[PDB]
Amino acid sequence: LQLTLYQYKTCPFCSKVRAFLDFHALPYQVVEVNPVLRAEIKFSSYRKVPILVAQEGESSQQLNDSSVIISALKTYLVSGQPLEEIITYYPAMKAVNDQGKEVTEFGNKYWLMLNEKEAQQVYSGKEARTEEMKWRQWADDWLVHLISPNVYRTPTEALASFDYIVREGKFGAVEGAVAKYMGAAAMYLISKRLKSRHRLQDNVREDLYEAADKWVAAVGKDRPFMGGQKPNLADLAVYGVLRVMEGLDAFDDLMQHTHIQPWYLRVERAITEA
Amino acid sequence: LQLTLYQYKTCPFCSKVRAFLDFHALPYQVVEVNPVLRAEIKFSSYRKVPILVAQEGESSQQLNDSSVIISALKTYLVSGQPLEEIITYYPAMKAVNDQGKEVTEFGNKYWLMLNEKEAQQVYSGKEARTEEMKWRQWADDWLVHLISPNVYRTPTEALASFDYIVREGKFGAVEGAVAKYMGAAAMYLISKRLKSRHRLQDNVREDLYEAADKWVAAVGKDRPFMGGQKPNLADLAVYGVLRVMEGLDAFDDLMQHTHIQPWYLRVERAITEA
Ligand SMILES: COc1ccc2c(c1)c(CC(=O)O)c(C)n2C(=O)c1ccc(Cl)cc1
Ligand SMILES: COc1ccc2c(c1)c(CC(=O)O)c(C)n2C(=O)c1ccc(Cl)cc1
Ligand SMILES: [Cl-]
Ligand SMILES: [Cl-]
């Protein structure tokens, strides 16, 4: 089973898949996609990243959605059922938006296709299973929306963010320089609207701290991770979404004003502990 | 187990739930909602219909999404697991649209929460289970979109449709008269755009026939219903969506130019056969 992960290193969706693969010590190769030309992903009809293709000898499968990849690869690690069958339980559901745009959502993306036996093996109980599902959805439907407005909240921050994005990502020496200044500007302004459209406060930092606190309270103090002893897909989902800001002011503030570090560091070492 | 179904009689979403309850000969009461004031539904935070509340003695549960109601009530009929636990597997997933609107989708809405045993009891095999799921989604993501443009396609048709909607539904003698002419007009124009936004052909009837044919070919000629011997959630989904046009020109045309009647009539008697 050879895993190749096509990604945008600094993207919360790719970090999410990495947090999962790393935690389960799964071996994979990563091909960094060029956000401007995206030639490395032009083999797929699915036009979003991450994309993960699993090769099993002569056979191979393309897992598209970041939440679907984790769900499919996970039910696979527990059930051992063929990946080509498992990916069949998370179908791409096409529909035309109320604006005429063709959206594609993936069915059952936060549900592991597990039987009673294996389910009892990975979950605390029925309520633990539906809880991570709810928090998996929160991570990318609410939490990720707090990244941009926060890392591009100030012109200085916007430049630091794109410096890190271009340095961390794949850009030609030329488009790198352009994207560094041009992209920081566009994103600084563009995020001013993302902040509004998503109904964020004026002090976006406060929206970040609230979510952070809302999370640690959810984890509670009776357990190290929402998953209990070890982190579960929900712990790894929030971790993966937040790690993306590591090194930026947003992250330092997060750690300094929220009491989220203990859990964060906990999920980190649980990962480095392969 | 007392079932109360709040609905809009002539709506495909309510017809879908009725087609299911009827087919399983489930006893329920229906309270017709006034589309204008909707007072009869103002007990629910969920602001869409159908809504189905199941009362079990002193306890009661509100099942909101038309596909979720069918999925939950169904897994319940097979597993016997408490409804209050079952509805827990189809969570409301909130998110803010790219336009700033708060949309709510229901997780795993087309997946019955069944174990190996019961699943083998209700499905032909693994491929039969994911096939109805795919056709359940088609019914409401593609098929329903062909109803309005087709039944409001012409001014004469628009009036006949609203005559039937007001006669079939719950409107005050006054607002009924208004809605009959005012609503027919609004819908005739409004559907002119629905036809465009949804990328429908100019001859919307053709879109209807194609879908119809696409369905009968899917069912094939080796089985009476997509579900084999008896109809399954996919057969009942398409039937429920189409019945809504019964009596209108659109429906007569459908039956006359598509070879869909045989299956349609087959699902009808399978239902009347309680
Ligand atoms: C190279 O491509 C990127 C990089 C970062 C991205 C995205 C795409 C998308 C979009 C997508 O997945 O296509 C989101 C939401 N990103 C961020 O959250 C983000 C993270 C850290 C910093 Cl410093 C600044 C921004
Ligand atoms: C009273 O309320 C109604 C009635 C009909 C409706 C809807 C709501 C919705 C919307 C909803 O569920 O809120 C859709 C999509 N309807 C139709 O398909 C339709 C069916 C038959 C005819 Cl003749 C004309 C139109
Ligand atoms: Cl593209
Ligand atoms: Cl500023």
SSE order and pairing:
The structure is a homodimer of 274-residue chains.
Chain A: E1 2-7, H1 12-23, E2 28-32, E3 51-56, E4 59-63, H2 66-79, H3 83-86, E5 92-96, E6 102-106, H4 116-122, H5 126-143, H6 148-151, H7 155-168, H8 173-197, H9 204-219, H10 233-243, H11 249-258, H12 261-272
Parallel strand pairs in A: 1-2
Antiparallel strand pairs in A: 1-3, 3-4, 5-6
Helix pairs in contact in A: 1-2, 1-10, 5-10, 7-8, 9-11
The structure holds indomethacin (IMN) (2 copies) and chloride ion (2 copies).
- Attached small molecules: indomethacin, chloride ion
Radius of gyration of chain A: 19 Å
Integer tally of domains of chain A: 3
The tally of strands of chain A reads: 6
Distance between the termini of chain A: 18 Å
Please identify the structural class of chain A as seen in this structure: alpha+beta
CATH topology of the largest domain in chain A, by name, is Glutathione S-transferase Yfyf (Class Pi), Chain A, domain 2
Give the CATH class of the largest domain in chain A: Mainly Alpha
Structural account:
Two copies of one chain form a homodimer. Chain A has twelve helices and six strands. Chain A is of the alpha+beta class and 274 residues long. The first copy, chain A, folds into three domains: 80 residues, 3-Layer(aba) Sandwich (Glutaredoxin); 43 residues, Other non-globular (Defensin A-like), CATH 6.20.200; 151 residues, Glutathione S-transferase Yfyf (Class Pi), Chain A, domain 2, CATH 1.20.1050.10. In chain A, the strands form two sheets. In chain A, strands 2-1-3-4 form a four-stranded mixed sheet. Chain A has a two-stranded antiparallel ribbon with strand order 5-6. In chain A, strand 3 and strand 4 form a beta hairpin. In chain A, helix 1 runs parallel beside helix 2, helix 1 packs across helix 10 and helix 5 runs parallel beside helix 10. The longest helix of chain A has 25 residues. One indomethacin (IMN) binds next to helix 1, helix 6 and helix 7 of chain A.
